Symmetry: C2
């Protein structure tokens, strides 16, 4: 059975866990708690491959299920959505370990509406980000939305399509079951030492 | 002709430029001096943003991303590992605290480079006998960290060899000596590191 190793946090691997549950893949986790030889996190091991880099890991899983895109144009479209979600999610992580977080968050939250609106407009004519069918950037976006809502519970008040998308992802039977399961890591969002999304509880 | 739009800097687009030159693709640039999301790439029906989507698209058109999920993952892994270096520079380059943040980065750098050094002991390029897009990403990353610290490759003779091997590819050698080459800046002009009009 494939092994996914990471900290016992949401962090970089949360969209990968959602994708795996969506696909009903069987996998074990190595969960590293607060306290090959270090090692390098996250990693993903099945028979064939040994991977590091969270984006290589999620892309591989998507790739094994033919979800990366059927032609160069489609695959670039998916890569583009990926990069656009990462600007949000990395935007959070970039400031979440600062003593100055309270200041830096002002800048971040000022730029967030424009970042969100691309996804909003995209969602006005598509059910999921790439259309009728779920793709891996959908779970990346879900994770980014979950994280920013802890930063600003109001940040989606002006985005009803994104509000709807978040509920839609939550209603996928595999996902709804996973979020209610004992497998679900609710918190922390970042490493425990973080000023935002760290600590033991919300 | 495809159009590549970006600031007139090296920045996020330099490896893409090296890939297009490697492949001898005819392309036009829109070079912004001194409003569109940058970079953009426009060929016939595709209009792309996000620099990773662009370089991967160009690679994809030339069948260079990988033949199976395993090989594609390996290339994405290489990609992500180069970006840890390149973005690592970028994230401190604009800080008032650059000089102090530099110390931490240069202390973490040998650890990052060693992975590439080992991988290059028994392969000519990152993925073996043939060039892939992460080679040009690595080239750009090496060029950048050498301005930060001229001696940071002294412990890495296989990386020093690799950088010269890339420069000796005839397309690359020619492009580097051409009028199209943008030598400087490495970052936005306003950066503390790799900014300004000249080195």
């Amino acid at each position: 059975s494939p092994i996914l190793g990471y900290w016992k946090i949401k962090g970089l691997v949360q969209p990968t866990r959602l994708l795996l549950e969506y696909l009903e893949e069987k996998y074990e986790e190595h969960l590293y708690e607060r306290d090959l030889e270090f090692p390098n996190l996250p990693y993903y091991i099945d028979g064939d491959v040994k991977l590091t880099q969270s984006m290589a890991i999620i892309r591989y899983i998507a790739d094994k299920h033919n979800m990366l895109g059927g032609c160069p144009k489609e695959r670039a479209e998916i890569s583009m959505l990926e990069g656009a979600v990462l600007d949000i999610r990395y935007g959070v992580s970039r400031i979440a370990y600062s003593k100055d977080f309270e200041t830096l968050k002002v800048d971040f939250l000022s730029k967030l509406p424009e970042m969100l609106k691309m996804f909003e407009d995209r969602l006005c004519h598509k059910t999921y980000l790439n259309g009728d069918h779920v793709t891996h950037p959908d779970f990346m976006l879900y994770d980014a939305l979950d994280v920013v809502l802890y930063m600003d519970p109001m940040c989606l008040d002006a985005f009803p399509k994104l509000v709807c998308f978040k509920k839609r992802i939550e209603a996928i039977p595999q996902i709804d079951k996973y979020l209610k399961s004992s497998k679900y890591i609710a918190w922390p969002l970042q490493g425990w030492q973080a000023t935002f999304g760290g600590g033991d509880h919300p």
